[PDB]
Amino acid sequence: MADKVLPTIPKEQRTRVAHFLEKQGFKQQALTVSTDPEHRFELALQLGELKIAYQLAVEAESEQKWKQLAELAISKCQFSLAQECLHHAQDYGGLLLLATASGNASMVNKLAEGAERDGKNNVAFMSYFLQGKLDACLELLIRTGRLPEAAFLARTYLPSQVSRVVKLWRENLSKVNQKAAESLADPTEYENLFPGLKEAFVVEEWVKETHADLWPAKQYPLVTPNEERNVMEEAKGFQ
Amino acid sequence: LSFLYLITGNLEKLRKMMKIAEIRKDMSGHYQNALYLGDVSERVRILKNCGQKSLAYLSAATHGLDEEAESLKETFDPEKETIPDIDPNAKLLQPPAPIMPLDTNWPLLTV
């Protein structure tokens, strides 16, 4: 009966009543009438026509929508898309949590790009590492003035930037003269670098490694490939 | 300090520390223990924070252990239905094979 009336209601009317309908709990039906982007939106949150919600979003026109929505999407476990929205949002933090949990390089490159974006030094490093990229970690340091720290990495996992880097750090120190403050040596004397001969470089292990990076470590797994990184690793690594 | 420990090419100290801060709660931090590692135990805890078998699967599958994550997931009345890219594809690799150190201890000189 009402439907005959329905033509003979418009804009705003629909809204009020929609709220009534919503009160009725005739959410779907409430959806059908739906009439305000906001109105549609909130209801949409309740409702979850997911795709449908997207169309309403269309171009959302507010990350806040995406943020709100992201939580919702994620709940529905409509991730493929969620990723698209979140990505669309480029809302890195939550998105990272998923991306990381299954794992992914690709995410990492784009993200790397992002990593560059973020404005505090630390996250970006994990990324660089995570990717496996000393190089990236070290380059990053150059901008931030992480210098003592950069040396440790450069030493540990040797890109022998310890030599290069140390000179520069030392130079800062140098600026701030005093001989102790200057501090000096790479192959020999103070440090014996390559003459010490101990644990962050060489070819053979490295060759084995070269491959290693390429295969999946294995134990028993899924399509989501292996790498391990534990006891075993220590042993071969020494070899 | 943990960072120093992972920088260096050795494994325990971070792990006790990991215990002792895991043990001091967490929602975003477990991550620290996992990467340089393969294996994590965090997952036992983690699932409890999540507990949607989702995290548990994503994480799970490779030790050849996707499976328990599914068992619960089913029990619940599952809710997963779509996923995004993420297939383990970034390198947790680097650190210190023989010749050209670590640095537990770092020598220098005033000279």
For A131-141, b where at least 16 C-beta lie within 10 A, e where not — what string?
bbbbebbbebb
Q: How far is B51 from chain A (nearest CA, A)?
A: 13
CA distances from A112 to A131, A132, A136, B37 (A): 9, 12, 9, 22
CA dist., res. B102 & res. A141, Å (int): 18
What is the SS3 assignment for A187? coil
Q: Which of B9, B106, B100 is nearest to A196 (CA)?
A: B100
CA dist., res. A238 & res. B19, Å (int): 26
Region of B91 please: left (phi>0), alpha (psi -120 to 50) or beta: beta
CA dist., res. A124 & res. B40, Å (int): 22
CB within 8 Å: A199 and B99: yes
CB pairs under 8 A between A and B: 223
CA distances from A64 to A27, A60, A61, A120, B71 (A): 23, 9, 9, 23, 35
CB B93 within 8 A of CB A237: no
Q: How far is B111 from chain A (nearest CA, A)?
A: 5
What is the SS3 assignment for A208? helix
**The token pair that represents A190 in the structure block:** 């103070």
**Cα B15 to the chain's mean position, in Å?**
10
CA dist., res. B76 & res. B70, Å (int): 10
Q: How far is A211 from chain B (nearest CA, A)?
A: 12
Q: Which of B21, B63, A110 is nearest to A95 (CA)?
A: A110
Q: Which of B65, B50, B11 is nearest to B34 (CA)?
A: B11
Across-strand partners of A199? B99
Summary count for chain B: helices (H), strands (E): 6, 0
What residue type is assigned to position A37 of the chain? P
Would you call A5 exposed, middle or buried from its count of C-beta atoms within 10 A (0-12, 13-18, 19+)? exposed
For this PDB entry, the determination method is cryo-EM
DSSP A35: -
Alpha helices, DSSP H only, in chain A? Answer: 2-5, 11-24, 27-33, 37-47, 50-57, 63-76, 79-89, 92-102, 105-117, 122-131, 134-144, 147-156, 161-175, 179-182, 193-196, 204-214, 231-238
* Among candidates A155, A197, A221 on the partner chain, residue whose Cβ is nearest the Cβ of B62: A221
CB B11 within 8 A of CB B106: no
CB B99 within 8 A of CB A202: yes
| Sequence-separated (6 or more) residues with CB below 8 Å from residue A183 | A170, A173, A190, B108, B109, B110, B111
Q: How far is A141 from chain B (nearest CA, A)?
A: 14
What resolution does the deposited structure have, in angstroms?
9.2
Q: At what angle do helices A37-47 and A50-57 cross, to 10 degrees?
A: 160
In B, which residues are within 8 Å of A238 by CB distance? 97-98
| Cα nearest neighbour of B80 on chain A | A77
Q: Which of A57, A49, A2, A53 is nearest to A24 (CA)?
A: A2
CA dist., res. A102 & res. A84, Å (int): 16
Tell me which H or E stretch contains B70.
helix B67-76
CA quadruple A78, A79, A85, A86: dihedral sign: positive
CB A127 within 8 A of CB A111: yes
| Sequence-separated (6 or more) residues with CB below 8 Å from residue B53 | B47, B69, B70, B71, B72, B73, B76, B78, B80
CA dist., res. A124 & res. A144, Å (int): 11
- Long-range CB pairs of B3-10, under 8 A, 24+ apart, other chains included: B4/A152, B6/B36, B7/A149, B7/A152, B7/A153, B7/A156, B7/B103, B8/A152, B8/A156, B8/B96, B8/B102, B8/B103, B8/B104, B9/A156, B9/A157, B9/A199, B9/A200, B9/B95, B9/B96, B9/B101, B9/B102, B10/B102, B10/B104
Report the first-to-last Cα separation within chain A, whole angstroms: 85
Instruction: Report A:33-92 residues touching B (Cβ under 8 A).
Output: 76-84
* Among candidates B9, B66, B107 on the partner chain, residue whose Cβ is nearest the Cβ of A199: B9
Q: Which of A195, A20, A132 is nearest to B36 (CA)?
A: A132
Q: Tell me which residue has tokens 């979140």.
A: A86
